[PDB]
Structures are given as C-alpha cells and as structure tokens.
Design a protein around this motif. Structure first.
Motif, PDB file in Angstrom:
ATOM      1  N   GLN B 193       0.826  -1.201   0.000  1.00 51.23           N
ATOM      2  CA  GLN B 193       0.000   0.000   0.000  1.00 51.23           C
ATOM      3  C   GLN B 193       0.862   1.253   0.000  1.00 51.23           C
ATOM      4  O   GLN B 193       0.547   2.223  -0.698  1.00 51.23           O
ATOM      5  CB  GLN B 193      -0.933  -0.002   1.211  1.00 51.23           C
ATOM      6  N   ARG B 194       1.967   1.233   0.758  1.00 54.04           N
ATOM      7  CA  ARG B 194       2.809   2.416   0.928  1.00 54.04           C
ATOM      8  C   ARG B 194       3.469   2.833  -0.378  1.00 54.04           C
ATOM      9  O   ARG B 194       3.468   4.018  -0.731  1.00 54.04           O
ATOM     10  CB  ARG B 194       3.875   2.156   1.991  1.00 54.04           C
ATOM     11  N   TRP B 197       0.786   4.172  -2.465  1.00 54.77           N
ATOM     12  CA  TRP B 197       0.286   5.461  -1.993  1.00 54.77           C
ATOM     13  C   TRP B 197       1.184   6.605  -2.447  1.00 54.77           C
ATOM     14  O   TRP B 197       0.716   7.732  -2.646  1.00 54.77           O
ATOM     15  CB  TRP B 197       0.170   5.440  -0.470  1.00 54.77           C
ATOM     16  N   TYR B 201       1.162  10.371  -5.110  1.00 54.51           N
ATOM     17  CA  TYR B 201       1.740  11.508  -4.407  1.00 54.51           C
ATOM     18  C   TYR B 201       3.095  11.146  -3.803  1.00 54.51           C
ATOM     19  O   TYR B 201       3.365  11.436  -2.637  1.00 54.51           O
ATOM     20  CB  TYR B 201       0.787  12.000  -3.315  1.00 54.51           C
TER      21      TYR B 201
END
Ligand SMILES: [Mg+2]
Ligand SMILES: [Mg+2]
Ligand SMILES: [Mg+2]
Ligand SMILES: [Mg+2]
Ligand SMILES: [Mg+2]
Ligand SMILES: [Mg+2]
Ligand SMILES: [Mg+2]
Ligand SMILES: [Mg+2]
Ligand SMILES: [Mg+2]
Ligand SMILES: [Mg+2]
Lengths: 158, 201, 87
Positions: B193-194, B197, B201
């Motif tokens: 996810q990181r 993510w 951005y």
RNA sequence: GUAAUACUCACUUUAUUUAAUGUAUUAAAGUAUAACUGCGUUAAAGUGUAGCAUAAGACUAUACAGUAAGAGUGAGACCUAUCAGCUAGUUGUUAAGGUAAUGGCUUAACAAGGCAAUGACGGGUAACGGUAUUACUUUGUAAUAUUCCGGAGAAGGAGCCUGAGAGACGGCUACUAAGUCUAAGGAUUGCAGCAGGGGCGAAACUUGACCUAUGGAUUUUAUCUGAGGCAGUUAUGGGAAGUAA
C-alpha cells in the motif's frame, strides 16, 4: 506516614481549623533519600499503578556533556563545591539537583581556552548537575564554560 | 526426651527412648551441629548423628535462626517455620522455640550420616521403595535409554504407569510459532500500500 | 447488525421522539458504514494517520480529507473508500 | 462527627494515574514447592522431621479512544455583641526534597506581612447536605429520617501488607474500656448484615419458604446470592364496596 493534605493548616484569616475524616492513601509521602558518593547502589520503588521508580543511595561515575565540542563522556565525581539552599551538604557530600561538583579530566578531550587551561594541567574540572538523582536514578549535567564559570566562582569557599 | 531418627539411604524412620543419664550430655547444642553417637549409648558406637528439628512439650516447633533457649513470639510470614498461610500477604503472630537445646525439649529429629558397627533391625535392615517418577521426558529418557521416543510404549514393553509432559510443552511451542506466521505477512501488505500510496503523491 | 440466517439487516439510529429504532435495509447498503473524522496527525516513521469517532486508525488516505469531513468504511477490508467534505 | 474543605451549579486540568473493553504498532536448555507415602506432637487452638522426594506455573514494550477516580477557581446557605480586635508556618520571595501530579504540602535563608461593623475571632445546635414529593399562597413561605444522587463510620484511637483501586474492618499489629474457654503451660470475640433475646422508654413485626421475575460475580442457557422476590403479624394511611328492595 507522611501526608500531603491541606486540611490541617489555618485559614486565610488566621482562625483554627477542624478535621472530619481520617488519613487517606491518595496523598502518601516518603522520606528523603540523600544521594552520597561511594560505590554504586540502586534500589527500586513501587508507585501508584505500576510505574516503577528508581532511587540511588550511593552514586558514582555520572555522565556529563561538553558544550563546545558537543560530545558526551563519563567522568568520576570527587567533591562538591556549592549547594544553594543548605550549606551543610558540602561537609556531608550529598548530591542533589543543581549543585556544582569537581570531576576528573582524564577521558575528556578539551579545546584550548584560556580559563580551563590552568585546571586542565591538574586532573580536575567543574560540572553542574541538572537531573533529579533520587527519582530518575542517575546524574547528568553540563560542563562550566564562559560567564557561567564567572558566576559560581564568586560563591566558592575561598 | 525420645529421639526420632531416619535413614536417608534406606528411607526408614523409627523412634527410640533414652535413659535419663544420657539426656544431660545433649545440652547446649545448636540445631545443625553433628556429634558422635558414642556419648549417647554403647549400642550406638561408631555412629555420626546430626540434629535437624524438634518439638516442645506443648507442641511448639523449634526454629533454626533465633539462637535462644526460651520461647519467642515473632511476626511470621509466608514460608517460615510455624505459620501455614491461607490468604495472600497476610502476616500474623505465633509462638515458636529457639534453636539451642535445653531441658524443655521433648523430641528430637536426628539424621544418620555414617553407619556404625551394629545394624539396626528395623532402621538399617529393610529398604523402602520409591513411589513417584518425574514427568519430564528429558530426565525420563536418561534413566531408561530408549532412542525411538516411545516413552509409554517401551515402558509397556518393559511391563505403575507414568504420564509424561512432552505433549503439554509442545502445544504452546506450536502456538508461539503460529503468531509469527500471521504477523509477518501483515508487514508485506502495508508496504505494498505504501509504495502504491506514493505513486500518486 | 445482521443475522446470518434469514438475511436480515438493520441500521441503528434514533427515531423522531428521542428513541432507538431499527430500520431494515438492503444488501447493497449492508456492506458499508459511515463515520466522522475528529483528529489527524503524522505518526512514527513519517506515516500519516486519521482518527475517527469510534477509535479506529487509518493511514495513507487521500490528502483532501480534512479534520471535520466524513468517511465511508467498507467494513470488510477495513479500508477508507469514499469521503464527503464539509461545506 | 462536620456551619464548611462537606453539598449544588458554572468553568480548568499543556498539572495527573487507570486491571477487565475497542482499534492499531512492536518483540519472542537450566531452576522450587504442593497435593502423595511414611514417623510423630499437645487439655484445646495449631504445628514438625524424612523420600538428592515428585507435577502444571514463573523467570514484550507502547499509542489513541472508552469507563473510573484524584486535584484546583468563583458564588450560595441556622441562632448569638452579657463574643471587638484577631493571626506567628501565620503572609510573601529564592532554593531543594517528596508525590502520579499543582501547591507552606515539608525543610533552610531573608523580609513584615495577611483579615475585619459588607461582623473578623469566639460560643451554642435537642445541625448529614441537595432532591423526587406534600401543604398554604396574589411577586413567595414551611416541612422533607421516608424515593433517588452525594459524603462519613464499623467499641475508642493510631499504624501497615497485598493490590489497577483499601489508611479495608464477615484482612493483620499494638494500647485503653469490657469479657469468654482450660487439664493452669496457653488459646481466643466485635449483629449501626437477616432473623432473635436483654436494657431503655409513652413508643414499633416471623430465631418463616425460594432462585420464579430484575441484577452482580471477565462468555451467567444448571454454581452461589437473608442483594432481591413470595407468603405470616399489626386500626400506618388512601381507594371499590356491604348491613336491603
Ligand atoms: Mg517437603
Ligand atoms: Mg523555617
Ligand atoms: Mg433534608
Ligand atoms: Mg454497638
Ligand atoms: Mg466496606
Ligand atoms: Mg471505610
Ligand atoms: Mg480501620
Ligand atoms: Mg459483623
Ligand atoms: Mg438485626
Ligand atoms: Mg406503633
């Protein structure tokens, strides 16, 4: 044993006061632990809801910080020079918060300043404690430099 | 006083009676001191004896660490001689007896160190067999050298049944590794996810 | 809340006269859940976080969600799906 | 017992602690004692020595919510002038110790402050504070042990262990006032818990059955529950009615 309540003191006007309940366990105190110099010794405490406290009966080899070069090194503790509130602690050698001491300059690597040079020929330097010894359990402090050395040395024994 | 004696190598204990003229020999002796059995009797020649306990005429036990002849009343706690606790942290007063032996001692507990000349007919002759075995498998395997780890089976092949405890400690040791499997994959999911993510951005 | 048998689902909010009610809903509404943000700060090792009313923590969300805006919890993957701003 | 520190209301706690709950982050071979077997002790109450005795157990850390509690500021509240001056850790400054925490809360050094006819300081109470609820009323008075919320105590005083939370009393230690058992060496008790007896008084009930319903004890469908229900005794009061047409 030792309470910290406020129900026993006189009023603002000066009249006497009266009690209505017994001693509670919420406001509970202890006796003074005077930290001496010698071989090291640490005992543990139990506080309210776990939260263990450490008290030091006899302390040695406190940590200190050099302000100019910004390094931290250990040194021994020899003597006490000044204590603010009570002047009898200097003959009994008790270490508390904000009381200046005399430390060995063996492992310390100092820069070349005019004031520290004459004491650096001998073994001794000066430091001031900044931590609570009886509750944290270990001493930390700063080395005296500059005009901070000019302030305390007027208060010495001479 | 009548003495109580036991045999540690045989597991037999017995009681005996003393004449009065041998009783004054045993005065002023601290609990835990050895003495020769010749001064007690002629029958007890060559015997080495040691005092380990005793009771009073009123039944009060004798302590080890108090070093007095007379009765004392200290504030006992859990585990001391004389007070058997029923709650937690609840300490109270009792009455005990000091260590040194005087005329008010009623019985004495005496261990046998070295056998003398003559054998006792009830104490030294018979042996009493042991009763319980360890449940731990590691010391169970040392006494009975079997490598194939059939602890109950080879004991049945040796055939008093013993229930080992190797199944119990294996159970929580399996559950301890069970957490590390599910915990580790959690660290992979948040990192996927990181990195996703930070792409926007 | 729901029963696994009979496929009965309910949403819990107040009626009109300050009393608890239970309203039967559909399986398309049975997935999600609504809550409201109260607080937001960055935690250890530079990871953002958003704290809701009930006490759930959520990380790596959209930066357009502010302190007072509401969210939409998927309730099965436990991931923030949609948000509605406050205006 | 306490005339206000207790209680009610409006604010603060960046000056603080929280087992059981919710959502998340992190870490992961060696060492005792019981029950058991076997020898005993004392009037009783309790206790001892052995079998290298022998079992299960014990040797991760934090956030944010949520409940619970501690600590502050201000305002309100009976009679008395045959009670007009009162206060010396008392008021303030600096420093340290101690507490989970602010603070003369305690201790050194220095200084002379602090409160009052808008009633200080004293004395009395046959004084636990609000409230649900009754009366009487033309801007409101009086009662309120009684329903519910809050505070204090377990013969009188003090001290402490365990514990997330006790200055605990159906937990322990000592002194004072009252006792009880004994084989005379010692051992032991707190009905302002439910029944019941004695005293006091003008004055107040069964030494009864039970987990049916509402609840508590870390999942409470079968464990416990004198909390709590169900019945007996009494002109404590309020209703629907009788003794005829
Ligand atoms: Mg044993
Ligand atoms: Mg002073
Ligand atoms: Mg009242
Ligand atoms: Mg009484
Ligand atoms: Mg109580
Ligand atoms: Mg109490
Ligand atoms: Mg008490
Ligand atoms: Mg009682
Ligand atoms: Mg009664
Ligand atoms: Mg009556």
């Amino acid at each position: 044993g030792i309470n910290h309540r406020g129900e026993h003191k006189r009023k603002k006007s000066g009249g006497k006061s009266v009690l209505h309940r017994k001693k509670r366990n919420n406001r509970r105190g202890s006796q003074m632990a005077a930290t001496k110099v010698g071989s090291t010794k640490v005992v543990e405490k139990r506080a309210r809801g776990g939260n263990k406290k450490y008290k030091a009966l006899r302390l040695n080899e406190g940590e200190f910080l050099y302000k100019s070069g910004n390094i931290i090194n250990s040194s021994k503790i020899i003597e006490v020079m000044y204590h603010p509130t009570n002047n009898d602690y200097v003959r009994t050698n008790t270490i508390t918060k904000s009381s200046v001491v005399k430390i060995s300059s063996e492992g310390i690597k100092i820069q070349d300043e005019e004031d520290l040079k004459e004491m650096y020929e001998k073994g001794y330097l000066y430091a001031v404690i900044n931590s609570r010894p009886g509750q944290v359990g270990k001493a930390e402090g700063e080395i005296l430099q500059g005009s901070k050395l000019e302030f305390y040395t007027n208060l010495f024994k001479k | 006083m009548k003495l109580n004696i036991a045999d540690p190598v045989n597991g037999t204990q017995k009681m005996y009676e003393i004449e009065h003229k041998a009783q004054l020999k045993l005065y002023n002796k601290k609990i835990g001191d050895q003495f020769n059995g010749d001064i007690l009797d002629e029958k007890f020649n060559g015997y080495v004896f040691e005092i380990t306990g005793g009771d009073d005429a009123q039944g009060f036990p004798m302590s080890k660490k108090y070093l007095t002849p007379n009765r004392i009343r200290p504030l006992l706690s859990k585990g001391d001689v004389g007070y058997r606790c029923r709650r937690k942290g609840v300490r109270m007063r009792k009455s005990v007896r000091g260590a040194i032996v005087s005329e008010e001692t009623n019985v004495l507990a005496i261990i046998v160190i070295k056998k003398g000349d003559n054998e006792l007919e009830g104490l030294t002759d018979r042996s009493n067999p042991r009763t319980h075995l360890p449940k731990k498998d590691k010391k169970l395997r040392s006494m009975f050298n079997i490598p194939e780890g059939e602890d109950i089976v080879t004991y049945l092949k040796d055939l008093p049944n013993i229930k080992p405890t190797g199944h119990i400690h294996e159970r929580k040791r399996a559950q301890k590794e069970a957490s590390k499997k599910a915990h580790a994959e959690r660290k992979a999911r948040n990192e996927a996810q990181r990195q996703q993510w930070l792409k926007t951005y | 809340l729901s029963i696994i048998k009979t496929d009965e689902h309910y949403r819990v909010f107040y009626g009109v006269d300050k009393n608890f009610t239970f309203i039967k809903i559909d399986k398309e509404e049975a997935n999600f859940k609504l809550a409201k943000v109260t607080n937001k700060k960055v935690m250890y090792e530079n990871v953002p976080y958003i704290f809701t009313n009930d006490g759930a923590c959520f990380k790596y969300c959209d930066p357009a969600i502010n302190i007072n805006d509401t969210v939409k919890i998927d309730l099965e993957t436990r991931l923030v799906v949609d948000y509605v701003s406050f205006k």
